[PDB]
């Protein structure tokens, strides 16, 4: 182990008043999918999820548009994979209040965000339990589901009684 022929190479570097271009600082990062991640694929700095699409592109295109003229599909240059673009922030927030001199606790409603915690058809509702019976509702929410304060006593959500 001390007299065998070893191949020894030396990689020296040059430093002068010349542009540095043989070096490549750009590094191809990991591909992440189904998460709200910012990307810059050659034409835009867009933030959104990258789902697995089922539509193929013709072998000369790089981008993808829709009926509303929005970039929602970009081919991945790493492996020629077609990925969709969908924004993450949807709608605002809403708060259910039983009223003055009735209760103190409130329930928070998300408009178009997908998730004690009940996944209603009108977004995410947190802070109000779901009960299968149906009464006449007073506080409208949407998609046929209301909220109310009944029996201690807490805020409940149910399908409205017609």
């Amino acid at each position, epitope marked *: 182990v001390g007299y065998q022929p070893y191949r020894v190479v030396v990689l020296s570097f040059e430093l002068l008043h010349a542009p540095a271009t043989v070096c490549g600082p750009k590094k191809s990062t*990991n591909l992440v999918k189904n998460k709200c991640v910012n990307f810059n694929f050659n034409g835009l700095t867009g933030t959104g999820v990258l789902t697995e699409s089922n539509k193929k592109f013709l072998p000369f295109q790089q981008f993808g548009r829709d009926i509303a003229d929005t970039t929602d599909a970009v081919r991945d240059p790493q492996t020629l994979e077609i990925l969709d673009i969908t924004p993450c922030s949807f709608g605002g927030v809403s708060v259910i209040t039983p009223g003055t001199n009735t209760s103190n606790q409130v329930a928070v409603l998300y408009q178009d965000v997908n998730c004690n915690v009940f996944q209603t058809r009108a977004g995410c509702l947190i802070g109000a339990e779901h009960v299968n019976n149906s009464y006449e509702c007073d506080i409208p929410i949407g998609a046929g589901i209301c909220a109310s304060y009944q029996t201690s006593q807490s805020i409940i959500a149910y399908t409205m009684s017609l």
Partner: antibody
Amino acid sequence: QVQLQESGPGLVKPSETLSLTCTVSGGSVSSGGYFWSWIRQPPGKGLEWIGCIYYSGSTNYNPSLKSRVTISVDTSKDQFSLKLSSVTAADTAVYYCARQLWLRGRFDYWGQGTLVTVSS
Amino acid sequence: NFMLTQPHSVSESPGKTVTISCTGSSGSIASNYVQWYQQRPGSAPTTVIYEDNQRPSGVPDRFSGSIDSSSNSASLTISGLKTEDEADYYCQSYDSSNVVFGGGTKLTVL
């Protein structure tokens, strides 16, 4: 930043199978082109290197611990686990999950060591 | 069959400059990079030097390392010993796809 946390039971019977998983938060397993390594340290003795893994199937093992280590990487759960076979009474060591910046370099970040004891 | 030889017990009063060695048996000590780890009792080890002469950001400048390749020994020089310095010191190697650690040196005080 990024941290490493271990899990799994602190006990294993002799001549059994060990299952300890090290989870990662604040980073990605397959991103950055880094390595993962398991290092053990018995109480009162020096550190012992078990093996190192890549986010692909590349593995290299200690010849004293060869044919007994089984380490796998699951990118979906952002964690990697080590499996040990034929554990004996001399395997009492504090197991450290340390990220390895450079293969022949140093483990820049070390996870907290779980205590593993064996008894019959 | 490459193992790092490290002094088991090194003891010194605070304030003097002490040297911790790490000798390789078969392979030369300049063949691969050697990393020193200072580990507190009941705590995870922490890297205190890298590339045999470079101190990572956070450790004091007194963690100076030197390489004596003729004797195949890696040296770590500690100057200005303090109370918190009482910890286990291990030297790392790589050999050939097989990371080998050192014997261990507790920094005992006088």
